[PDB]
Amino acid sequence: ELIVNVINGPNLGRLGRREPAVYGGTTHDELVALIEREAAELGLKAVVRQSDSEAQLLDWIHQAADAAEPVILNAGGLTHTSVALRDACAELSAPLIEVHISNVHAREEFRRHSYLSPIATGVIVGLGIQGYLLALRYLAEH
Amino acid sequence: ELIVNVINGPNLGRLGRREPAVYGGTTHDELVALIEREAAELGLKAVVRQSDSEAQLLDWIHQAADAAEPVILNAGGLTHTSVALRDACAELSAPLIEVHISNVHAREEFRRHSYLSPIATGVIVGLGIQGYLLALRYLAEH
Amino acid sequence: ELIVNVINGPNLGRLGRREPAVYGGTTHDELVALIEREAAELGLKAVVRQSDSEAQLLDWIHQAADAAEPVILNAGGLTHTSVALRDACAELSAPLIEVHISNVHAREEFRRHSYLSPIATGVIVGLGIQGYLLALRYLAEH
Amino acid sequence: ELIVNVINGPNLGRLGRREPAVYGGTTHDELVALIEREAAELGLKAVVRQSDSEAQLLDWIHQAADAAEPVILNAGGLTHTSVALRDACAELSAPLIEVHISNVHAREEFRRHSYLSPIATGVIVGLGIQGYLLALRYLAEH
Amino acid sequence: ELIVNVINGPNLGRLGRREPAVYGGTTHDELVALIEREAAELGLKAVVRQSDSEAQLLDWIHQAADAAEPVILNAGGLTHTSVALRDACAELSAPLIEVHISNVHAREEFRRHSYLSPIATGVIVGLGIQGYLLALRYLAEH
Amino acid sequence: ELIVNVINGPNLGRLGRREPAVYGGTTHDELVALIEREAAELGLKAVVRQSDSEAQLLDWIHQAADAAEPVILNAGGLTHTSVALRDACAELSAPLIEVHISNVHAREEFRRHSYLSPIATGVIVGLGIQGYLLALRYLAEH
Amino acid sequence: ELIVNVINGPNLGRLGRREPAVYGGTTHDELVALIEREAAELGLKAVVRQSDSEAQLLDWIHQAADAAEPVILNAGGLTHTSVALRDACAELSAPLIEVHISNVHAREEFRRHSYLSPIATGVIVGLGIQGYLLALRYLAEH
Amino acid sequence: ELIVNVINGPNLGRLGRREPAVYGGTTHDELVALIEREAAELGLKAVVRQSDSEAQLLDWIHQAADAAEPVILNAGGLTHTSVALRDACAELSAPLIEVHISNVHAREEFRRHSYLSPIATGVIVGLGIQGYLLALRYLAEH
Amino acid sequence: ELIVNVINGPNLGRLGRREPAVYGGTTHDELVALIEREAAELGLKAVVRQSDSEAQLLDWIHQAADAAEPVILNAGGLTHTSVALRDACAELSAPLIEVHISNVHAREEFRRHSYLSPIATGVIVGLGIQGYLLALRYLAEH
Amino acid sequence: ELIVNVINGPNLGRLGRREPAVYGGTTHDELVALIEREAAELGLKAVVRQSDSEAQLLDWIHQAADAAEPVILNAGGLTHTSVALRDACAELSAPLIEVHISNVHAREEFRRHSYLSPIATGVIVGLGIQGYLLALRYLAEH
Amino acid sequence: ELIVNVINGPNLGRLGRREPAVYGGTTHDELVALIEREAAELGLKAVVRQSDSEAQLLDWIHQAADAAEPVILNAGGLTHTSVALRDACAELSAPLIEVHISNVHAREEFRRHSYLSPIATGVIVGLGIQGYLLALRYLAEH
Amino acid sequence: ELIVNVINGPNLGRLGRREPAVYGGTTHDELVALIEREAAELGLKAVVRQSDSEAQLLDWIHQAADAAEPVILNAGGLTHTSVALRDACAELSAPLIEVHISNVHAREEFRRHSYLSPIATGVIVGLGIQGYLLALRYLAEH
Numbered sequence A, B, C, D, E, F, G, H, I, J, K, L: 001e002l003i004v005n006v007i008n009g010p011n012l013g014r015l016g017r018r019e020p021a022v023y024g025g026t027t028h029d030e031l032v033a034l035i036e037r038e039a040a041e042l043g044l045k046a047v048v049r050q051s052d053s054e055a056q057l058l059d060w061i062h063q064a065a066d067a068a069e070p071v072i073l074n075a076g077g078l079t080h081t082s083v084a085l086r087d088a089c090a091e092l093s094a095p096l097i098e099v100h101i102s103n104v105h106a107r108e109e110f111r112r113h114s115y116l117s118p119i120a121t122g123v124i125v126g127l128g129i130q131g132y133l134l135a136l137r138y139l140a141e142h
């Protein structure tokens, strides 16, 4: 199947806005372009969505559940806090790849826990924006 | 630079030996072949080593430290237990990508802790043997 | 008084959609019908609402607070995570019955904690969709 | 099948004896009468027993195991402490409904843990003596 | 009022039997005699009972609740484990003095917790058999 | 600069509605008026906003980040639960003053933890609605 | 000395009654016969007793203390909960061998703690009913 | 009433002495002057005292208890360690405002606990020396 | 020997000063008189001292160590916090009886821990000022 | 099948060398002789190996996995620390009996945890060198 | 620079007074003499002070801060309890060597924590009074 | 006796190799020379060994046990992880001095725990390479 859903959670629309010492440079719009391009090279179609609203994220997850489509999810802070997002993700029959740009293990202790990792197929963290592209390649070869 | 070190720790020589319901099929020799091939496609040279001996792993890490070469490390059970391996890895100036074949977050609680993740560049788990190939691609694009 | 509010939180609109091995069969629309029918047999009027949005749930709780109406609440994942929902529920002067379809004590440890149970009148879990009907009957006899 | 066992543990024979500010009013004998009456309205026969002796409770549970009869159990303080009672209850093939009169989540932290909840079909707490009658109705509709 | 109940729990009938290096010398019968004598000097009547059966202890506590009589309780190992005994003791309207012969704080960590201390009037530990006599004197002056 | 953002989170629109024994009397509209008046006396302009929606709060925080404006934040229950709100607040270059009306240390243990306090400039709790006015005065003198 | 006491606690009278997928097949009466036979082959006399009553178990332990006889004890659920049984067992001058049929380390975490193991001579778990026979052989060779 | 007691604990006499990168600049004598001036503008009299001696602090607290005078307390390290200071502060009938210059939540975990916060009226941290002046203003408006 | 040292720690000089709902009525001077009188009836001499200064308490303990005199100690808040006081008390060769007026187990969890209880002969709590007199009687009979 | 592997880990070669108050008397060579003799009486062949090297232990475990041979394992300190040894042992299809000479529950708390017990068939501790012989007898009867 | 401050905390004046089985023999005066002599051999001047008063210790630390002089500190029980002493020690610009006579890791668990170790240059424990002399030698060679 | 064993564990052969900002400058060979020289000045002979292999370290410890020779041990990462090394060290009859170059209390929390400290004579940390020389001097004076 061509279709892969890339879903970004709270604050992910802020990439590139604060000082390019940090998660700066690549904007969310640029990230979408990079993803779409890589997906086309791989023979996939990426549908990339971002929201600061948990309810909106839940709706996108429900739609992927109903369509049996794979999901690459960076849930932002909700990674660490939301059982509701886990409940929705546990419905997915297709692969779920959890992605984080930063190395969530190199910061505060509360970031080393994810409600999603135990139900995800796999997890990529700390490899920057390329982590999304690597997830796409996993899905293309599976 | 061409050279990337792939270092596999205890029990990783056992891939493919127990019932192909599990981490079965791909042998360690096959894994080496897959890695070497992908590395050549990427314009890298992969040097793949496996040992059940922590001391041997430490020596390989020291050599990568001295040569300023990147390391893709799957330390096996020592991931969860060895401060000595962390101490050696903290010396590396080039990237360190932690890889696990299985999703270490979907099993016992003790597997969700890694001495290596806080000092690694990033971490890939649960994406099977392709996780090594994805790490290689990260290193090629950086 | 006739009026009882039944409020369902995130993911509760998904009942009946995934494989009828699981929380499958009864849809949310069917649940509403069952509740309305039981409420009429008991001489009550049930107002049944579901949302994936915490803000919407909070508004429904506020309205029940202002009207001094009882609430039967299945907050879904927010049961385990939301202090805001607890704060809103602590305002209710009429009874609050917490309901869960599944036995929240027979799963992961994080599901055995509820922010709501300490401020609820009582709690029913694991009795399936009938738990809502039993809550209704409690309220009718009180 | 007609037969449902209602089993009450330590101190449950004390209902109604201390000041009717508290769990006062309804005596254990009255509780038995209420249960028997509700059971007959539902087309069941309730066999209601109470003991302060764990060994006696265990024998009643064994008998329900051997007869494949459902059990409504309020184990009193043993809810929070007895692995032996859990071991005996895990043998039951018919439903086990855990009931508590008080809201065990609104008191000391040690009362929020039950050895029985993980192996019970479901749990009703905080709905007073009506919780037993609601358990009976669950069993009648299943 | 004259009457004070002294209630001893499991293993307390073993005083004086194992090597008089330890809680040896004074037998339970001797303890009863010492208590009765001190009580008469104080103008009280002590009713001293011992059982290895929690159910029997519960019955004695119930009787003290119903008679509004003070209780001096050394619950033995049940001090550290029984919520049922606490539930029964919380019914007592007259004073409850918890007594232990040994210093329960000078041994294993699990002995430093008592289900009874938070609901007792007070607690005497480590003063040997005289702790019972001191409890009696407290009750005589109050 | 004149402009200070006062942002109130879930349930803060409920001030003054439940029995004036409690956080009763001052309504949210009154709070806004008090804040605006104090801000004008101090030579500032306060922009006061309240929402029960985390996504809306995040947008207001983003806008303050982009405008480099100070924020006085009472995040309500999200204080204790939301990593996403912390992530957004960590972007602010201007001061962040955390305010709570109640003394969050005098209630349940879960209220003594704040995701925001470690990244805030400072914190005021328990001084009632005047805490907002005191935060304003801090910002005016800095 | 010939005499060894085998003492079985709550629920041990249930062996062989529930579906022979589980601890099924060997009944408690059969277990007694196997033990007696092995004891005679070893030149010992086994006295095998079972009770669901902690008080009865305590009396049997007291008798072994007074007679200076070894004890093979499978305390069932009381293994994990009873300080009183530990107190009684600490009196034994002869060896105490703790036995469990099941591997108590391969189940819930609460089963991995025993009040008895620290005061037992040794412990055998997970070797089925043969664990009793192996304990007997230990005692015969010592 | 005019009189407010400002009490500073151990090390607070060190303000301004170590390198003005840190809590440098304002000396304790300067702090006293700032406080006195602000108090006079508010129509109060501030009595400002500092000691490194817990016993001296206790005496000042006792005097405020006896005089029914409000206290603004920065107990320094004793904030985190002293139950005796809490015991003395619990006697105060007038308001107690806890103040810290630094943000105690932005440092080591042990600094996020205060024995005083649960019994204080409120708490101000991280707003520098102005926190004292803001406490004064709270007391003037109440 | 006649001499017994009664040592009272921080805040104990405050008895009787705050509202006689609480630890009110008996002043410290009255307590001294009661103790002296009881000691004379018992054929002892009580030397009663109180200080809010840990250093002063330590000196009194040292003197009791050097003189091999028994100590009845109510260390106030230092009970829960001071290792130094424990170190000094561990030197005492004569009995050490820990006394608290209030039931330290019926309040906050931090009050249920004492650095002194493990090294004391015994402990009396919750029996009011009579606890001192009962300690005196223990020492007279030993 | 005849063949049983007895594998001893670090420090087990030290038996009998330090003062025969302790694990003294029986040397490792003597242990091997005792095991071989018992195995022959049982109709088995025991292959007994000891190493201080985790890598060597892993190789012996791998060989038992490949040959489908039972293992009696005393991993010494690695019992408490090595996930790698657990990973290797989880491959074994034949029984795994964990043995310890000492009672690991009667010492430091860290010795009461074993990475091996949850995946072993059973566990024998505290029965001295006879524990190996008893394991052999288990395997002979199964 | 010649000058080194040796500061001893509570109870350190008790060295040599209790039975020379223990920290007996060397008195505090002897310790001072040994230190002074070693310091002169090393070309230093040691200023040795001891107090049971935390306030006095704080003053000595302040003076060392102001003079930029090194400190060898054995804070006695305050090692384990005092944040105030840590706050004062964090001001020191010259080296801080923490010394304990006893091995603080070989006793109760609470002694294995030090508020001082994280801010000290280094730590010497368990080497008796020579630990002070070794600290002096460290300072002489640096 | 002349002979002292200095044993260095994993990674200690790396001293001086990574950037002389850090544990840089002194190489392991230089460390050996410094130790040998100091030992000769003290009238001792130091035998200095380093290995990355736990098995090799264990053999060196065994040899020191058999020869009754003192050991100065810096076990590197195994300090924090190895029970096997502790088991071997507990055999030593001569002194064991634990040394670390860095201050293990000033880094991650896992470094503040040592399996060796409770069985060592004493411990020196944070005093750099001179810590070894100071250990040597301790042993020379004892």
Ligand SMILES: COc1ccc(C[C@@H]2C(=O)[C@@H](O)[C@H](O)C[C@]2(O)C(=O)O)cc1
Pocket: A010, A011, A012, A014, A015, A023, A074, A075, A076, A077, A078, A079, A099, A100, A101, A102, A103, A104, A111, F083, F084, F087, F088, F091
């Ligand atoms: C202020 O905007 C952002 C955007 C992304 C992040 C990182 C992402 C999060 O939202 C974190 O809560 C999470 O721990 C890591 C993260 O998901 C990532 O690295 O992609 C943080 C702040």
Ligand SMILES: COc1ccc(C[C@@H]2C(=O)[C@@H](O)[C@H](O)C[C@]2(O)C(=O)O)cc1
Pocket: B010, B011, B012, B014, B015, B023, B074, B075, B076, B077, B078, B079, B099, B100, B101, B102, B103, B104, B111, J083, J084, J087, J088, J091
């Ligand atoms: C029996 O051989 C193996 C080989 C690999 C594994 C998985 C790897 C480990 O060694 C585990 O300790 C680790 O938690 C996960 C692992 O590193 C992986 O999934 O690659 C387990 C057993």
Ligand SMILES: COc1ccc(C[C@@H]2C(=O)[C@@H](O)[C@H](O)C[C@]2(O)C(=O)O)cc1
Pocket: A083, A084, A087, A088, A091, C010, C011, C012, C014, C015, C023, C074, C075, C076, C077, C078, C079, C099, C100, C101, C102, C103, C104, C111
């Ligand atoms: C994917 O849709 C659902 C719907 C309901 C549930 C169960 C409900 C929840 O949302 C859980 O988070 C909660 O622990 C139990 C639950 O509230 C219930 O059993 O009703 C789970 C997933």
Ligand SMILES: COc1ccc(C[C@@H]2C(=O)[C@@H](O)[C@H](O)C[C@]2(O)C(=O)O)cc1
Pocket: D010, D011, D012, D014, D015, D023, D074, D075, D076, D077, D078, D079, D099, D100, D101, D102, D103, D104, D111, E083, E084, E087, E088, E091
């Ligand atoms: C003194 O008699 C009683 C009777 C019932 C209770 C409540 C029941 C218990 O025995 C408690 O231990 C349990 O936590 C709650 C309880 O099972 C109930 O509410 O039914 C308490 C004391």
Ligand SMILES: COc1ccc(C[C@@H]2C(=O)[C@@H](O)[C@H](O)C[C@]2(O)C(=O)O)cc1
Pocket: E010, E011, E012, E014, E015, E023, E074, E075, E076, E077, E078, E079, E099, E100, E101, E102, E103, E104, E111, G083, G084, G087, G088, G091
């Ligand atoms: C074997 O007989 C006894 C008798 C009394 C005790 C001490 C009492 C107990 O039953 C302990 O569980 C409890 O911790 C202390 C005790 O209640 C006492 O010291 O009186 C112990 C064993």
Ligand SMILES: COc1ccc(C[C@@H]2C(=O)[C@@H](O)[C@H](O)C[C@]2(O)C(=O)O)cc1
Pocket: C083, C084, C087, C088, C091, F010, F011, F012, F014, F015, F023, F074, F075, F076, F077, F078, F079, F099, F100, F101, F102, F103, F104, F111
């Ligand atoms: C039902 O409406 C409210 C409004 C405010 C509060 C207090 C605020 C919260 O939302 C709490 O979750 C928080 O712990 C304290 C609070 O932020 C405050 O005191 O301002 C509680 C319930």
Ligand SMILES: COc1ccc(C[C@@H]2C(=O)[C@@H](O)[C@H](O)C[C@]2(O)C(=O)O)cc1
Pocket: D083, D084, D087, D088, D091, G010, G011, G012, G014, G015, G023, G074, G075, G076, G077, G078, G079, G099, G100, G101, G102, G103, G104, G111
């Ligand atoms: C329902 O009857 C039984 C009988 C034996 C057991 C196992 C035994 C127990 O009573 C458990 O509580 C214990 O953890 C293990 C057990 O003692 C054994 O395996 O022998 C469980 C249920």
Ligand SMILES: COc1ccc(C[C@@H]2C(=O)[C@@H](O)[C@H](O)C[C@]2(O)C(=O)O)cc1
Pocket: H010, H011, H012, H014, H015, H023, H074, H075, H076, H077, H078, H079, H099, H100, H101, H102, H103, H104, H111, K083, K084, K087, K088, K091
């Ligand atoms: C070395 O002098 C000082 C002075 C003040 C402080 C900060 C204050 C303390 O004493 C800390 O223990 C406390 O955690 C914070 C503090 O009370 C404040 O920020 O006012 C620290 C060191």
Ligand SMILES: COc1ccc(C[C@@H]2C(=O)[C@@H](O)[C@H](O)C[C@]2(O)C(=O)O)cc1
Pocket: H083, H084, H087, H088, H091, I010, I011, I012, I014, I015, I023, I074, I075, I076, I077, I078, I079, I099, I100, I101, I102, I103, I104, I111
């Ligand atoms: C404000 O004066 C006092 C006096 C005594 C107390 C009780 C005593 C303390 O100092 C407490 O810290 C301790 O927990 C209990 C106490 O030692 C007692 O009840 O005697 C409390 C406050």
Ligand SMILES: COc1ccc(C[C@@H]2C(=O)[C@@H](O)[C@H](O)C[C@]2(O)C(=O)O)cc1
Pocket: J010, J011, J012, J014, J015, J023, J074, J075, J076, J077, J078, J079, J099, J100, J101, J102, J103, J104, J111, L083, L084, L087, L088, L091
């Ligand atoms: C110094 O040589 C030894 C040999 C055996 C032991 C006991 C074994 C260990 O290696 C311990 O780590 C383990 O906790 C217990 C042990 O496995 C046993 O009792 O057989 C200890 C030290």
Ligand SMILES: COc1ccc(C[C@@H]2C(=O)[C@@H](O)[C@H](O)C[C@]2(O)C(=O)O)cc1
Pocket: I083, I084, I087, I088, I091, K010, K011, K012, K014, K015, K023, K074, K075, K076, K077, K078, K079, K099, K100, K101, K102, K103, K104, K111
């Ligand atoms: C009764 O006099 C003393 C003197 C020194 C000590 C040891 C020192 C202490 O004060 C302890 O609190 C600390 O844990 C260890 C100690 O600092 C040392 O060994 O020097 C103990 C009791």
Ligand SMILES: COc1ccc(C[C@@H]2C(=O)[C@@H](O)[C@H](O)C[C@]2(O)C(=O)O)cc1
Pocket: B083, B084, B087, B088, B091, L010, L011, L012, L014, L015, L023, L074, L075, L076, L077, L078, L079, L099, L100, L101, L102, L103, L104, L111
């Ligand atoms: C990369 O080489 C090294 C060498 C020494 C260290 C410090 C030593 C260790 O191996 C640490 O695991 C330990 O916590 C501290 C250490 O033992 C020391 O400071 O000597 C660290 C890395």
